[PDB]
Amino acid sequence: KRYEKLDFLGATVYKARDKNTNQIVAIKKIRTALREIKLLQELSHPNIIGLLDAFGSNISLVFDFMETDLEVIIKDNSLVLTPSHIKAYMLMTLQGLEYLHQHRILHRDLKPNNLLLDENGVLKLADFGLAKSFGDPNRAYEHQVVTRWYRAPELLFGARMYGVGVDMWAVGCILAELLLRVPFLPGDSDLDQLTRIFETLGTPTEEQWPDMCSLPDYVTFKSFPGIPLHHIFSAAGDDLLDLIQGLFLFNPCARITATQALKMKYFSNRPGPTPGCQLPRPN
Ligand SMILES: Nc1ncnc2c1ncn2[C@@H]1O[C@H](COP(=O)(O)OP(=O)(O)NP(=O)(O)O)[C@@H](O)[C@H]1O
Ligand SMILES: [Mg+2]
């Protein structure tokens, strides 16, 4: 309507120019979008993508333009991530997520390519296509799960009741991927995803996860010992290992929350988070 289509980016996404401010934006063109406009229009947090406008003739959602995303950074061999880089990305991720959870919203699709980065190193959660108020019902056969590699074990065992844990597990997978620069648990099937979770983190005992055997799709895997976190992340300090451990607890009620994650010593310890403007950018 009042936007000129500049470059194509990848539903269909275009770069554009707002003729009011001459501001550069991203326009996403196509009931998935109804629920999205509802939440996103009224939210406002630096680390949550802003919905600037919408119009219907199909639906077009107008978003802040973000020059890159975490997956691009992770896959870019010319960039080396320092401990301070990783700390900055996690802090922005968790502050965004803490906001959402305080507003009783689950993202439900956290993965590196949904953490967008602007030219000033501001990270923003995006793609609220699966986002849900905590108390909304979970559909029978149209149930929307994150891509498998970021997916919490309770979801892989068919949980219909879940909460904050699904996002926090994903956040642990994103952290692991920042550290390893490859996906942490790349399952090739939903069963193989559980296999990989268990042979890496151990097959849960009933005291680690009391209610596991009563999940709708529970089945008996072999007992795997797991691998010590300090062996997997050989460059991570004890403070980072404690955060990673908290994010991958099997019991979704024991798993660390965004708020608890942000209060951990990791975030107050040296080295500090990289200022956004010094974060490494694809050249
Ligand atoms: N706000 C934005 N600013 C700049 N580029 C963007 C923005 N949002 C999306 N893009 C780009 O457009 C592409 C469209 O991909 P997209 O379809 O959003 O991801 P997807 O996970 O494959 N499907 P979807 O469910 O639509 O997210 C992305 O990979 C980005 O490179
Ligand atoms: Mg996406």
Q: Measured between alpha carbons, how far is 193 from 187 in angstroms, rounded to an integer?
A: 4
Instruction: Specify the residue with its C-alpha closest to ligand 1, atom 4.
Output: 66
Place of tokens 């959660």: 125
Would you say domain 68-278 falls under CATH 3.40.50.12780? no
Annotated binding residue 10: yes
Q: What is the CATH number of domain 3-64?
A: 3.30.200.20
Between vectors from CA 253 to CA 106 and to CA 184, what angle results, nearest 5°?
Answer: 70
Range(s) for CATH 1.10.510.10 in the chain?
A: 68-278
Which atom belonging to ligand 1 lies closest to the Cα atom of 65? 3
Helices 165-180 and 238-247: crossing angle in degrees, nearest 10, is 140
Whether residue 183 has a cis bond before it, omega within 30° of 0? no
Mutate which of 13, 28, 113 for ligand 1 pocket (most atoms within 8 A of beta carbon): 13
Q: Measured between alpha carbons, how far is 123 from 103 in angstroms, rounded to an integer?
A: 19
Q: Look at residues 30, 89, 98 and name the one whose alpha carbon lies nearest to residue 60.
A: 30
Q: Look at residues 37, 27, 177 and name the one whose alpha carbon lies nearest to residue 93.
A: 177
Range(s) for CATH 3.30.200.20 in the chain?
A: 3-64
Pairing relationship of beta strands 12-18 and 24-29 according to DSSP bridges: antiparallel
Q: Look at residues 68, 86, 24 and name the one whose alpha carbon lies nearest to residue 281.
A: 68
- Cα(201) to centroid of ligand 1, in Å? 32
Q: Are 170 and 256 in contact (CB under 8 A)?
A: no
CB atoms within 5 A of ion ligand 2 belong to 114, 127
Q: What is the DSSP string of 190-251?
A: HHHHHHHHHHHH-PPPTTTSGGGGGSTT-----------HHHHSTT--HHHHHHHHHHT-SS
Which atom belonging to ligand 1 lies closest to the Cα atom of 129? 25
